Amino acid sequence: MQYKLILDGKTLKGETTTEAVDAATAEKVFKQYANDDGVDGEWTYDDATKTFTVTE
16 A cells, blocks of 8 residues: 655755555655654654654
8 A cells, every 4th residue: 555754854855755565664764764864753644644743
């Protein structure tokens, strides 16, 4: 399944995607991506749109 990540960081904003078997797996992929880009924030998830948001 496709999942989307919205980054609402102080110095990085935008969106990316990944393909994952479920949302728990997508969450780990996205949390690694965000950490690698220095984005530390609060994570929220909307299942209807398969979209994570990280807000710094």
